[PDB]
Amino acid sequence: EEKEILWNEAKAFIAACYQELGKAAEVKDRLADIKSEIDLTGSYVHTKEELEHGAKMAWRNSNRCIGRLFWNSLNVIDRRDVRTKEEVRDALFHHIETATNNGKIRPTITIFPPEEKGEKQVEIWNHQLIRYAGYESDGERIGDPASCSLTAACEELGWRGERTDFDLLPLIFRMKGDEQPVWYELPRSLVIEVPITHPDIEAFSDLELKWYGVPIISDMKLEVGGIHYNAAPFNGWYMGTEIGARNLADEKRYDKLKKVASVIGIAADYNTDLWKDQALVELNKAVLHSYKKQGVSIVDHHTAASQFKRFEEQAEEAGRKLTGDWTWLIPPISPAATHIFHRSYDNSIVKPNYFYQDKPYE
């Protein structure tokens, strides 16, 4: 059954991929080669070109991503050669550096060796490569609540956070054959952070907010033609609402709207004053302003929706079905000011794609 699942996904993927790459005449032979390899080895190995295009297809198929216009410019780093924890560590450092690119962020993915018998070669514990720790003890809340479980796991392993609201979590990952993960502090010189200021309201700096430059999701599985790349961190650049409307605003995250209201000089007493809405708009303005001022790439939700409209058009022109998850594509502020809110999307799963996987902590 497992070989058949693999073989069927392989046929589907190779046909589509080679069709897109102008290589339809190479399909029959490549399929034959793959068939023998599966019989004899239990699996098969992608060519560099298959791996690159597969990672690109997987982004293009990601229903929850508004950023997909740029799917074909993904920089794919092939690290199927790594065997040691030092090499994994250095690959992850290099990903941060090359993706950051001094603020002119480059969409990048680093692909590590795939699972074999469902057996992981490298298992990355981080949710993102750069993320802030979170703590909750005797009612006292510090940092990012969404990080509490991973932070506790790290502190079981000998790491200790300074208990600032913005402690960088170490890289933490496990190698096949090791019972425990290892962890490494991130060099601060690798990590760009942006202090949050407002274009008009001087006092906004009194909040002492900041965020990191680059979101690098590091715990999703890339599936390509039946091969499971459980370790394949990727990044683009942020849409400003991710930071301003969710990370800094959610009651279960940094929960800053009351403090924002106070610094922008409005009362936070009556729902009818729409003070949360007003605070959200000013916080989201501050985020965009701050990243721009610092020369770190970011997109606003209006521009991002416009680009996504072009992605829809490009799909139709290419004769490809569009898939999307309306509930994630709408921005969390002024969604009805975008075209996305006014149409529907087919939420079917097409592969290659990126998938959730169970967290080894928790």
Ligand X SMILES: N=C(NCCC[C@@H](N)C(=O)O)N[N+](=O)[O-]
As annotated, the active-site residues are: 65, 68, 237, 242
Size of the site for ligand HEM (CB under 6 A): 20
Q: Does 342 bind ligand H4B (CB under 6 A)?
A: yes
Contact partner, 341, from ligand X, ligand HEM, ligand H4B, none, Cβ < 5-8 Å per class: ligand H4B
Burial status of residue 110 (CB atoms within 10 A of its CB: 0-12, 13-18, 19 or more)? buried
Burial 10-31 (b: 16+ CB within 10 A, else e): bbebbbbbbeeeeeeeebeebe
Q: Does 66 bind ligand HEM (CB under 6 A)?
A: yes
Q: Min. distance of Cβ 240 from ligand H4B in angstroms? A: 13
Q: Does 325 bind ligand X (CB under 6 A)?
A: no
Burial 73-96 (b: 16+ CB within 10 A, else e): ebbbbebeebeebeebbebbbebb
Q: Does 71 bind ligand X (CB under 6 A)?
A: no
Contact partner, 245, from ligand H4B, a copy of itself, ligand HEM, none, Cβ < 5-8 Å per class: a copy of itself
For a copy of itself, give the closer residue by CB, 332 or 360.
332
For ligand X, give the closer residue by CB, 237 or 291.
237
Instruction: Identify whether the C-beta of residue 351 lies closer than 8 Å to the C-beta of residue 13.
Output: yes
For ligand H4B, give the closer residue by CB, 101 or 149.
149
Residues annotated in a binding site for heme: 65
Those residues with Cβ within 8 angstroms of residue 61's Cβ, 6 or more apart along the chain or in another chain: 323, 349, 350, 351, 352, 353
Q: Does 132 bind ligand X (CB under 6 A)?
A: no
Residue number with the smallest Cβ distance to ligand H4B: 328
Q: Min. distance of Cβ 232 from ligand HEM in angstroms? A: 9
Q: Residue 144 is encoded by which pair of tokens?
A: 């990012």
* Strand ranges inside 177-310, DSSP E: 182-184, 193-195, 210-212, 221-224, 227-229, 234-235, 238-239, 298-299
Stretch of 73-81, 89-97, 308-316, 336-344 lying at the interface with ligand H4B (CB under 6 A): 336-344
- Chain positions 72 to 101 lying near ligand HEM, rule: CB under 6 A, are 74
Torsion of Cα atoms, 23 then 27 then 28 then 29, to 10°: 90
Give the whole-angstrom CA distance, residue 102 versus residue 46: 32
Backbone angles phi, psi at 124, to 5 degrees: -95, 125
Residue 298: which of 311, 286, 309 has the closest Cα? 286
Contact partner, 271, from ligand X, a copy of itself, ligand H4B, none, Cβ < 5-8 Å per class: a copy of itself
State the pairing for strand pair 221-224/227-229. Answer: antiparallel
> Which of residues 135, 173, 237, 275 is near ligand HEM by CB under 6 A?
237
Give the whole-angstrom CA distance, residue 358 versus residue 150: 13
Residues in the chain: 362
Q: Does 189 bind ligand H4B (CB under 6 A)?
A: no
- Chain positions 211 to 250 lying near ligand X, rule: CB under 6 A, are 215, 217, 234-239, 242-243, 247
Q: Residue 108 is encoded by which pair of tokens?
A: 């990048």
Stretch of 57-65, 124-132, 141-149, 191-199 lying at the interface with ligand HEM (CB under 6 A): 57-65
Torsion of Cα atoms, 17 then 23 then 27 then 30, to 10°: -90
> Which of residues 327, 347, 348, 357 is near ligand H4B by CB under 6 A?
327
* Strand ranges inside 279-348, DSSP E: 298-299
Stretch of 63-71, 86-94, 174-182, 312-320 lying at the interface with ligand HEM (CB under 6 A): 63-71
For a copy of itself, give the closer residue by CB, 70 or 93.
70
Binding site for ligand HEM (CB under 6 A): 59, 62, 64-67, 70, 74, 107, 109, 234-237, 239, 242, 299, 304, 328, 354
